[PDB]
DNA sequence: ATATATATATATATATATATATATATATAT
DNA sequence: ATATATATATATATATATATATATATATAT
DNA sequence: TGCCGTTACAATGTAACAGTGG
DNA sequence: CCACTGTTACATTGTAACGGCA
């Protein structure tokens, strides 16, 4: 009984910790990359919008 | 090196490559004897869940022919895997008729630029005509 | 991990995948799900595999008393049972010696 | 490929059928024997290959069934390839009494070991003495000869139940026995909290219990 | 029907396709029970070197849902096999960067032409512009 | 493991009925064409399968098959 | 009330695998 | 030119597993 | 409708060239 | 020099969607 319960508990602990370390890492990487890409995108949006009116009135 | 090398991923890639080659019938082993080749292939199969040992199996029984193809295929797979993240770095596969491709390749070799660059120049000249029509 | 950089997270995920390769060899369908979780075009697959793992550990619960289905919760009950069985084992060894 | 077990039979089913315990266990099951936790080897064998053996026995149009209490047995269907039979009403009475004794705390001192005398005493305590004797003999009115006849009938039914695995005689004594969880089947008509006339219909539909 | 169909060739094609799918894990047969599926796959494996019987094998044990995929795969194989004889009928495969492909496909969808026709038109317009300037 | 031809014999759809009739003591003669042919084909393995039960699968000189129980 | 069928245990003989000790021919140190 | 160590074959006999036959208890049915 | 050609992709494997650093 | 890496230009096979035609 001790052997079986210890084996099951160790299996549970190892699977849980490894799966969490496997997934949460890429999850946080995705979150950070998305935030950085949004921050970069806003500048292009603003500059494009300014050039839009500039060339709309320049003609 | 521009792309990070991940050991536990490339090892699995290499193992899958070996298994695919073998099941296709090619002689991945360097052994001419049937028995040793069969034993080495069986050991590689056992190595399915231990990609780390695949490097040692490669150094121990890999056919000397396949090193160049190995270093080519896994390198290309790494590039593609890292490029697949974003659309703007992906590649698109298209098929071209022989006359069209012949003309396009001759033009590209004339201008000394890649096919995508030549297509860019052509479509950009067309778009310049369109732009000046629009103004 | 929010402080870490892309390379560190990628390496950590690589190590975790290396561990899961050994931890999963016995299972067939969960192993297949892990293999499919490798695609970079479909990151959601990862989470699916994660759920599968839980959906596995949920069924590995032994008896009614261990039905804290949340696997992170049954660990404490298992350890309690281990302590109880340890004291019981000491008593049984004493009995056998006499 | 050919000359390969998977062509005809699953690997695990073949392993189960090739196990040393399979033939005796199969003969006992087809004979009507229930399997409880006491038969550690046979019970574990059934547990390991429960699905393989269930699908094997399905070929005979008989269901290998595990009751929630954890004891396996066979229930033939109407189209059974293995014949089917029903317990006598006295057998049902004695099985219900045995289940009661299993659940009765008053007999805790016995520690599970019971004598036919105690079983008969409990039977007469819970049942209708003379009207139960009526089945033993149609012309009984409390005659002690019919009393001994009823005792002998109870003993015979107890032996029959022993044959079914509901009861075990002690390794050296045939006058004492230990009850097994299989007896719980005798209460399958009351394990569900509904109208008796509906549970009976459910059971007879499921094949568990024909009427008399 | 443009390309004549040859039985001893297309049947070998079908056998190879089914063996490839089986090796890939695809369920070739319609039998959910593993024993019958294994028996049918063994029949197919030992059925090599036979058109007239691989056709019957397909008719009898082939998975219903793979019929369309196999049919279109054989269509493509026939067309490619017959077109690969001459240089001018062959097809050249290239990889285009996603922005370039996006713009090219935009033009092709806008004008109703195919990629080959679109590139032909673009090269011709470039030549005409060259002649205009020159 | 198990003998392959024995597994083939066990898996055959005729096996359940024939097995029940044999264990019931019934004698299978030449009249039962399907059963007789099955026993003819698979005797070498069914003899071992039923010897695992401490019973002997006997083909009489006349030809009919039957099961003879041992003492055990 | 007693014949009969059935399950269990023991004694007894068969057949096979295997370890032991001896005999014989050859190899190699003395 | 010799005697001891090795490898081979053989008979011995040791033990197990099997199958048979007999005795017993005893539970059924007329 | 169902077959049959045709296109536009996707996934993977390779050869050849260009870079980069040890 | 030399090796290892990134990239381009193919090939090879499979698949889904259109559209023609009996």
Author numbering:
A (entry chain B): 248 to 306
B (entry chain J): 1 to 135
C (entry chain B): 1138 to 1235
D (entry chain E): 2 to 213
E (entry chain I): 1 to 134
F (entry chain F): 9 to 80
Publication passage describing the model:
To gain insights into how MukBEF interacts with matS sites during chromosomal unloading, we purified P. thracensis MatP, identified a cognate high-affinity matS site, and introduced the E1407Q mutation (hereafter, MukBEQ) into MukB to slow down ATP hydrolysis (Woo et al., 2009). We then reconstituted a complex of MukBEQEF dimers, MatP, and an 80-bp DNA oligonucleotide containing matS close to one end in the presence of ATP and magnesium ions. Focused classification and refinement produced a map of 3.1 Å resolution for the more rigid head module, with clearly resolved ATP and magnesium ions mediating head engagement. The clamp has a highly asymmetric architecture imposed by the kleisin MukF. However, the ν-MukB does not form the cap/cWHD interface, and κ-MukB does not associate with an MD. Within the clamp, all core subunits of MukBEF are in contact with DNA. The MukF linker is guided over the clamped DNA by the MukE dimer, which also binds DNA along its central cleft. The linker itself contacts the phosphate backbone with R322 and R327. The MukB heads bind the clamped DNA along their top surface. The “larynx” of ν-MukB provides additional DNA contacts with Q1327 and R1328.
The ring-like structural maintenance of chromosomes (SMC) complex MukBEF folds the genome of Escherichia coli and related bacteria into large loops, presumably by active DNA loop extrusion. MukBEF activity within the replication terminus macrodomain is suppressed by the sequence-specific unloader MatP. MukBEF is the SMC complex of E. coli and other enterobacteria. Its SMC subunit is MukB, which associates with the kleisin MukF (Woo et al., 2009; Zawadzka et al., 2018).
